[PDB]
Amino acid sequence: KDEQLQQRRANQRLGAEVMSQRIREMSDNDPRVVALVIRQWMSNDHE
Amino acid sequence: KDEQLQQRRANQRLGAEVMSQRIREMSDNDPRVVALVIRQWMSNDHE
Amino acid sequence: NLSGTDKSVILLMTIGEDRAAEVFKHLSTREVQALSTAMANVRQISNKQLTDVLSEFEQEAEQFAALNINANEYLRSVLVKALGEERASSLLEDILETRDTTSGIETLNFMEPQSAADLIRDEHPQIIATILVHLKRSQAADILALFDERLRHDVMLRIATFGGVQLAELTEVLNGLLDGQNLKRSKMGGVRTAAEIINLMKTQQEEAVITAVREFDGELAQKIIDEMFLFENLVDVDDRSIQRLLQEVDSESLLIALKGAEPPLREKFLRNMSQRAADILRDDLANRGPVRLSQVENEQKAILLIVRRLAETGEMVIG
Amino acid sequence: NLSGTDKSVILLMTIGEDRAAEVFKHLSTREVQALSTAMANVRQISNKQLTDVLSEFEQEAEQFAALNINANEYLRSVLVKALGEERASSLLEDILETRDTTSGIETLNFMEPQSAADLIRDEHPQIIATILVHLKRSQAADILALFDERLRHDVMLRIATFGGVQLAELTEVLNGLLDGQNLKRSKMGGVRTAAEIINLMKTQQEEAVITAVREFDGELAQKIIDEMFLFENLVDVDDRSIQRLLQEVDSESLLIALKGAEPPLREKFLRNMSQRAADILRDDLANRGPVRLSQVENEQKAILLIVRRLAETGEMVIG
Amino acid sequence: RRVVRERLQALEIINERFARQFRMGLFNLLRRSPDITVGAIRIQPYHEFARNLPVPTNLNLIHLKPLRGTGLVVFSPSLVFIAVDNLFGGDGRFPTKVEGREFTHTEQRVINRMLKLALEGYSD
16 A cells, blocks of 8 residues: 555656656747746736 | 647647748748738738 | 737748848838737747648738749849839839828828827928828818918918929928827827826815816816816707716616706706606605715716716717 | 645746746746745645646646747847847837836736825826826826825826927836835835724723823824724714624624613614514613623624624725 | 135136037937026135025035045026926926925936936036
């Protein structure tokens, strides 16, 4: 049980970090998709 | 789901950039088809 | 939906930096600034939007097919070898100025007549007469109407005297007056924005302001009050518009507003209604007791906001 | 549930340090400080939360697709080769200031009218008039209402005199007033927080404080008492709100509070109730004997806390 | 006991040409041609000048290297009011008078533009 949950957390972290690298590469290759989503972020923050 | 959407976005970007290169080459080889469409653009902008 | 400007903006990013700079040179600096601001803020194209703008540009390119070059020099070079460069420069400049002076004529026709008149009020009466002749007869009259009697009479007198029909200098005259608009800005100078703020201010505060400006200038105060005029009397707003208000505003709010209104105001707001509606309104006004004036003023302000919205829609005129 | 700020905060950690610094440069220093505090305290993302914030960011990226760069320099460089760098700097700065001055106009419209008026009270009457003209007519009136009669009258008089419609200096004027807000802080200066503390204090203690401040300044004491005013008389709070209290507070607590209340207070708190309820309350008040004033004061304080909560909800106004 | 006498020639012409330069500078700054009337050069003790100075008014220190000491310039509240309202395009037919009240931040900034323009004019 606990060991299975720990392994699930580990593989979830691995998937999260590789997919975060996907964010990193797409943001590096296209800044426009970054500024507008930042604007959406601040819209959500103030809303 | 999300991975399929990401791959769709990637291939759409590739198609968009090659077809934009098609615009680039046709505009380079014929400026007349550019000025009139710019006039149409400003017509749409002010209309 | 994507606006026509945004599609054009996305196309301007897509066509490349050198082509964008060339288009900036070929177009107006205000357009250049608008495109720069647009590409700085948020990109205008999404994957569906980019598809749409690119597809509609393609359909524009399919339709704009002619196998030709802009030749802002290549066409002249082919002409120059056959006839010589000189057999063109002057004539081409004259043709462009004729296009330019007609463009200015149309622009002056479109832009506001009194603004044109005051821009040309300082100018020569011969200038006024020739520009009036060149303009549309509706536009020429509109500039003429906004003049004083003496200047206007001199303008019509000089209309006949204008027999020189001069030609390069006229275009340069249009160029000179054109360069003064971008510095003029304005568009708020008229005693209307201050009038709206006076309406917005607290009742006693704008009453004191009205007294102060009456002390400052009775004529200016009277002009601003004429700008104030909104359903304070029957003749200015007309019985049809009085009917329009009552059929567009809540009856309870109208009655509460009429509580503090003048008896001529009640009479003008009751004549339009039928006998039954007028009797109901009069009975409600008689039965309802005194109410704190704050709510009455707030409802009156809301009603006048509705009136201003109707005037902006332009169904009928007020004044 | 994860708040929109926390999702944005987690995304700010995830996007990398250099990108976070660039976003800090592109955004406000208050946002930079908020993000720094958030990443210092507790991380905002759990494994489900990180999945949610990353997924929603992905859906934002799918929708925000345009194949474009921010180009806070690259776009200018493409424009500069085609037309020249100068054919832009001035126009781009003017456009940005127009966006900046409109941003300041909207900010002033949103922020409190009297605060804007006192921030501009020291400033030039021409400044007041032009800012009033530029502002919304509701906002312009709100700043105008909070002025003295003489300054207000001068402002409306100068509204007409404002014909220069000046343009870079106006933006710099907005910049100058903008830089004074971050130092102003305040937001408690008004004699309201002290009023709440006076209410919180022990009955005899705030009575002595009221006497002392009456000695210090009768006008200030009267203003603070007007701030005190909470269901001490019928006209200030209105019969509808009196009805609202009785249907929202326990009858026993209301009666115990009415034990030490004035007979006008009992009359105003009995008129709203029906005949049966009023008779029951009067009989209970007559039958119940004397009680130590500590419990009566505590229940009155609880009732007034309920009244303050109702006022905060904003169903009806009090005063 | 403090006595000084002298007669001056050159600084009169210097003031006249600086006044013309300042007039054209203000003309281009405020899109309206001003007129400057240079008064007769005044020689007086510092206390007399201070007494004659209309309080309130803004005084500014401008050093003159390599000569030891700092120069002084002053501007009237009427002048700053008129200049700032002309900057706003105000007619000025409803003027206000402020006494004892220190200049606001914006007013001090406008004073800063007059100061820099005058400094450049006198420098040239």
